[PDB]
Amino acid sequence: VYLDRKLLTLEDKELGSGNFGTVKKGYYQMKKVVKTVAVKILKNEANDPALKDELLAEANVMQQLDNPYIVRMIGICEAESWMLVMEMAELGPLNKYLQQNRHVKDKNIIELVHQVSMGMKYLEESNFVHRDLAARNVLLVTQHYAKISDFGLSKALRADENYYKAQGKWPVKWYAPECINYYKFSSKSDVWSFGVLMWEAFSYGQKPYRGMKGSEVTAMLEKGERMGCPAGCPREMYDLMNLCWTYDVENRPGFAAVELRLRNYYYD
Numbered sequence: 624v625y626l627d628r629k630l631l632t633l634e635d636k637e638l639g640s641g642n643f644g645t646v647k648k649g650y651y652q653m654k655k656v657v658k659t660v661a662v663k664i665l666k667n668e669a670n671d672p673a674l675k676d677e678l679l680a681e682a683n684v685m686q687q688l689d690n691p692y693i694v695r696m697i698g699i700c701e702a703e704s705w706m707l708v709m710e711m712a713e714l715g716p717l718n719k720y721l722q723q724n725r726h727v728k729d730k731n732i733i734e735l736v737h738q739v740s741m742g743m744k745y746l747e748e749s750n751f752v753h754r755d756l757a758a759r760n761v762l763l764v765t766q767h768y769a770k771i772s773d774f775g776l777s778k779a780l781r782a783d784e785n786y787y788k789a790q791g792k793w794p795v796k797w798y799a800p801e802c803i804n805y806y807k808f809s810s811k812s813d814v815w816s817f818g819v820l821m822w823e824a825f826s827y828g829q830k831p832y833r834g835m836k837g838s839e840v841t842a843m844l845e846k847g848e849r850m851g852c853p854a855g856c857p858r859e860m861y862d863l864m865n866l867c868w869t870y871d872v873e874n875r876p877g878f879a880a881v882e883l884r885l886r887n888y889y890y891d
């Protein structure tokens with residue numbers, strides 16, 4: 624079903640944007656209380672069939688997810704444009720937050736990346752691949768509560784395979800070698816991305832592989848080289864990043880193992 628446009632009120636505040644259109648702050652009338660929302664709105668009155676199809680696929684994935692560490696969809700609305708209404712994570716993207724808050728303690732960063740690993744362990748159990756995991760796609764509810772967002776590239780895995788074979792966005796810097804070379808996306812390739820996300824978080828929102836072309840990143844990784852340890856990053860956390868960047872898909876850990884490593888380190 625669809626949300627009632629008359630129960631949605633959009634504010635002038637823009638939270639984000641991209642090729643699809645914009646994301647605006649708003650409020651939606653629930654069964655009794657009013658709820659603060661973020662609303663993804665397609666540009667050009669949803670003229671583009673591709674953007675429409677993509678928004679519905681994004682909604683389809685989110686409808687099936689229910690986890691505390693993943694952004695919740697309230698619903699979809701077909702009105703002046705097509706709109707995807709979500710619970711708002713009011714501190715915004717993790718990368719931008721850390722850029723602006725260098726005082727955040729290492730224990731706090733560990734806490735947040737552990738939360739991301741819990742959301743991803745759930746996604747893995749649910750057999751969905753995210754395909755766009757990155758620090759810009761983790762939103763903060765509070766400084767101690769992270770949620771995974773941006774499910775526009777996510778896929779439900781077939782019952783008989785543990786990967787999706789791509790037939791758009793190509794965030795090479797977050798992609799595992801098998802994604803680049805064989806177009807195969809699995810929970811293991813999400814683990815590689817999570818390694819990059821960890822590097823970003825401990826680098827207070829710095830972009831990875833800075834100054835390098837995609838082709839140069841691919842060549843670097845092919846010859847067994849990896850990004851260095853961020854300043855002040857605990858060695859155990861850098862060791863985990865390197866494990867996430869295991870070239871061999873089979874030998875690379877899954878999220879159950881990654882989450883457990885983070886869980887144990889966080890609790891000493």
Ligand SMILES: Cc1ccc(-c2cc3nccnc3c(NCCCCN)n2)cc1
Pocket residue numbers: 638639640646661694709710711712713714715716759760761762772773
């Ligand atoms: C200062 C600030 C900036 C952005 C947001 C915000 C919150 C959101 N909550 C739920 C869903 N989407 C959201 C969103 N989308 C746009 C940014 C996409 C990043 N990958 N932004 C909040 C505060």
